[PDB]
């Protein structure tokens, strides 16, 4: 047992030279092994991954932790996320730390530690994530990431170079004798030993410019004279709406002349090319895509969005999958003969303007990779990103797929919009992202949470923030909403409470100015700040765990705790709306019982209903008075 | 003949097709061979170098050009850098530029392009640099570089991993038949043959932390064990003045408790620890500091300031060269026997506290690291840095074995005090830093430059900024400053004028944060910029070569060529300073002739005698009336 196999190892190296930095925060209570200077501690590692390895299967039973906890449970069902607390995290970065203890971070340094985060270091912070109530940790791509086009030193997760293979730098070489599909498998074991559930985050229909796929599969991608490559941009048409064309749109989109120079750009694949040619390099060592320019003089397109006049920049370090072997039906008859397959905002959106012909080797390749992690290491649901995208009978065969091994899986949605909740269902999935985060951290706009989780027909992560969003502790009155808005959303009806890497230590600094950002978000570090103006997604970043917000941190143990006391009366309680203009406000009331959830976002103070009551810490009086941007869970 | 060699490449490899991406300013006025699409102008990398190097070599004339200019003009004086107008260039930075033509910079592109600076690149900006006027050209180091203890994702220049080899980064793979020294040598053949001077830049007192010399003299370093690295850091004694302690002061140094505990972290040499252990290590694959810590646990330590209670941080890139085999002289009656060589601010400055020992073969190897350059490749000067260190018998051997080789040879000396020239004279040296940035960029402090350097005894790099200041466009009223700074300073006795790179379009971010500079000159660019935040001396830089300040490079260009057309008088007519509060001027008179510097720097308007007049452009009146902030040349 992989587990077991490494802690065996790490007492085999145990020496107790400390001289491997970690912040204090990561060493757990029983742990005492440890030198303290400058405000950072100091460890064998060896002794730290033996003790903690320990810790955790001391509390193992004698059953086979690989599968799905589901299958140990006995689940039939995805319900069990309906009672989970979710902490989202990109291991890179959450596991990050300078183990010099000294000087500047760096990806390896001389005394042989990998200072990025690893597999192994993700598994010594178990003990962490289980003391903030979480019992799922939902992982962003972790997958084989590409190095080209990278927009900083650090690739997107999303620029998937392998769907099938883990990246190669979640290794730790401290775990030498092991390989990296074994340190995962060996994580994956841990969080299930402490009940704690594995989500991962697949994206079918994108791949790097230089996926490993192109060597065997050619012809899964679009091509690109390489001359074209400097002004290639999605064809505006102004006078036309900023969005998806719809059909009668097509054909004047294809009559316009940028449009036709762009259908011009493309070309076939190199195998079709030259087929001894690709032969050749096919079989050569090197970046396949470099072979490939150098060789045919033609390149994998960059992506962008499938609105037309999208201001958004061009997607250069992915480009997309070839979902189907004709071109779009609805626009063939505006085509001229020959065309080579291309990019355009149809063909983007093969789940509107599908061909005839669907790409079923591709198709099944893509339904394979998350049944292929189920089984290897049994992680137990999945986020599935631009699923708007893929065509019904695809997305269908990838849910069938996973549902078949394990009907207990739980897919997640990447749906902002909680409108289209009842579409998602539709669809198949279990859960939907939504977006309250934007809502929550607006006192303007926090009251119409209520209504708009009441309505829901699946259950949604409750965020005040996201890996794309801005940081909670950088919003409007940002001192009292960083504990006022968790508070108001983590109690929401159908709510899957949302805990964000840096979150618990009210980190400022964004990881990706993605959704809802302002690029002056940049610079909300100190320029004496070594991480200063970096962003997580694109370069190596390390959370402020040296200097965290202890106010925060406490606050939300007590949140996720006092809210799983309460959990029965969230999930079968009957609920009421009651909120006003200046009082956010709810209640749930179960067997003559009720609580009430209140937020005060008004300008003058108010006053509600006593009882016990709780906003941090519990009191008892009749009447409360809540001033401006407080809070508090009444009981009566 | 290499840059005949390189030429015919170019010829052979051209093609035609125009994929390589240079900003408009890179292209030269004969070259017609591009497409200009979105500002910036494509070609075909083999096209502009044929049509450059071909530019260049017309001119040559039928002498071997790979040696000194002074040799070709049979100098025996250093005389001629009186003359010249030196640009100051840290190539990896002013040849970078993103070739693709579209997305983000890459050290290392798909196309097969070299995105950083090369000095193929550095060759092809010849004409530009012509352009400017000067005919000498200054690089900071570009010896081979640690990649180890790196404050970015570039190493700083000065991390010196091998003196007597060229970084192999500043090859360009679009010569892959060519070697980095090959191309180099062509570099000064190009400059020799436009009668271009190369000044290059040695730091012999440091070294890098993993220096390439440890393998064959391990004992040439300091050492440390491992388990002391995280808290190495200079013991201070705050009681005592922030300085360079005297012999006085080291008595009390010594007997400190913390200044005990600082010795005892260091060891002997691995070749002393363990003989056998070391050769072993000493011929194994991987770099040769990670074995050393690895098999030995001990490690060379970080260099830190020579003045006690710096502020400063410890320079963990760089280590320092054991100069002595004994300890310091004065300070052995303070050892305890058997002390292994230590590091301490008198250690590190040789000059005051010497040995009786001296390291014979280090120091032969140092004085033969600028002749290995004068022979190689005929470079035609050098700036020595940290010569403030080396004891006096080191550094006149250094100066004589290049003055023996070529007498007409400048040593530059890095010495900020304008007031230790005549020491800096008395060193062996021909030309001094100074600091006039500092005062030029001040209304408040530039009048007191025209004495600061009429009584100078070595002539000085006249500078607004350098690598190591604020850019002086981002100075107090910048718009008026970067036009009055330059025109006062480059007009002054003893001046070479200096122009640093990216001064010449305007270039705002600084390069670096070394002297006289604020952290939150980390953000003058725009959030949305994507070199925002970054230090072009630890991380990839782009200069704005695509926006910029054409007013300034215009104003740059006619201001040297003005200056030169006056040299006659600023070398060798008499100098008058009639600077008042309000108005900072001078005047040179030679052969009954006269001109007058003028730079109004009051509140209020002054006038002045007329005559020919040039502010940027010629006029001509009788009186000359300046506004707050402007200046005039004045010809009587
Ligand atoms: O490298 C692809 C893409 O990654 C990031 O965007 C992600 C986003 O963070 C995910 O939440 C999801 O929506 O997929 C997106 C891309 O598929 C970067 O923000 C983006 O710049 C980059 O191109
Ligand atoms: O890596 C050494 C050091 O380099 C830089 O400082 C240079 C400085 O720029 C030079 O002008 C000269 O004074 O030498 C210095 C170091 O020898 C960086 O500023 C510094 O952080 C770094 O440690
Ligand atoms: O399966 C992908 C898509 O299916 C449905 O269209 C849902 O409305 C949407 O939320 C989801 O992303
Ligand atoms: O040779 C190194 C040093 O020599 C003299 O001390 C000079 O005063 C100083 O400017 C120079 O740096």
Partial sequence: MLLREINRYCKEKATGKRIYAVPKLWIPGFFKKFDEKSGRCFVDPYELGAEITDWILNQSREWDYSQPLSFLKGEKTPDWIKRSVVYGSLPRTTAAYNHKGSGYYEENDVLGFREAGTFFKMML???????????????????RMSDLFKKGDAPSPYSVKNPMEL?????????????????????????????????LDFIPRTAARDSDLIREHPDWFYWIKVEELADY??????????????????????????????????????????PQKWEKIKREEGNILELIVKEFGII????????????????????????????????????????????????????????????????????????????????????????????????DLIIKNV??????????????????????????????????????????????????????????????????????????????????????????????????????????????????????????????????????????????????????????????????????FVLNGKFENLTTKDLVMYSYEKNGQKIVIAANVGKEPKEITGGRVWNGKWSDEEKVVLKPLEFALVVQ
Avoid at 319 to 331: G, I, K, V, W
Avoid at 543 to 556: C, E, K, T, Y
């Fill in 233 to 274: 941009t999605p064809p505006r048409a102004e006078e036309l709406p900023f969005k998806v064309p719809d059909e009668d749109e097509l054909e004047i989109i294809y009559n316009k002349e940028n449009v036709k120079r762009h259908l011009k750009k493309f070309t076939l694949p190199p195998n079709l090319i030259d």
């Fill in 167 to 199: 990246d190669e730098r979640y290794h730790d070489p401290l775990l030498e004798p092991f390989k990296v599909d074994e340190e995962f498998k060996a994580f994956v074991e841990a969080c299930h030993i402490l009940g704690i559930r594995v989500i």
């Fill in 125 to 143: 912070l178990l003990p962490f994530v289980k003391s903030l109530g979480a019992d799922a940790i939902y992982l962003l791509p972790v997958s």
């Fill in 300 to 395: 994998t397109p960059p992506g962008f969005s499938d609105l037309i006049n999208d201001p958004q920049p061009t997607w250069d370090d992915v480009t997309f999958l070839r979902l189907y072997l004709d071109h779009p039906e609805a626009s063939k008859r505006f085509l001229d003969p020959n065309q080579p397959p291309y990019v355009l905002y149809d063909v983007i959106k093969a789940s509107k303007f599908p061909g005839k012909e669907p790409n079923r080797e591709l198709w099944e390749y893509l339904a394979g990779v998350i049944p292929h992690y189920q089984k290897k290491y049994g992680i137990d649901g999945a986020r599935l990103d631009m699923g708007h995208a893929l065509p019904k009978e695809l997305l």
């Fill in 403 to 568: 549902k078949e091994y394990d009907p207990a899986f739980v897919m997640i949605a990447e749906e902002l919009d909680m409108e289209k909740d009842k579409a998602s269902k539709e669809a198949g999935y279990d859960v939907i992202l939504g977006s309250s985060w934007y809502f929550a951290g607006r006192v303007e706009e926090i009251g119409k949470l209520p209504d708009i989780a009441e309505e829901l027909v699946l259950p949604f992560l409750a965020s005040v923030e996201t890996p794309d969003t801005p940081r909670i502790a950088t919003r409007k009155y940002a001192s009292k909403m960083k504990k006022l808005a968790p508070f108001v959303t983590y109690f929401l009806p159908n709510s899957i409470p949302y805990v964000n890497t840096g979150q618990e230590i009210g980190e400022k600094q964004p990881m990706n100015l993605g959704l809802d950002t302002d690029p002056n978000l940049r610079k909300v570090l100190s320029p004496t700040d070594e991480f200063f103006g970096k962003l997580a997604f694109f370069d190596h970043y390390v959370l402020h765990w040296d200097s965290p917000d202890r106010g925060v941190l406490n606050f939300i143990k007590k949140l996720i705790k006092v809210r799983h006391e309460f959990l029965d």
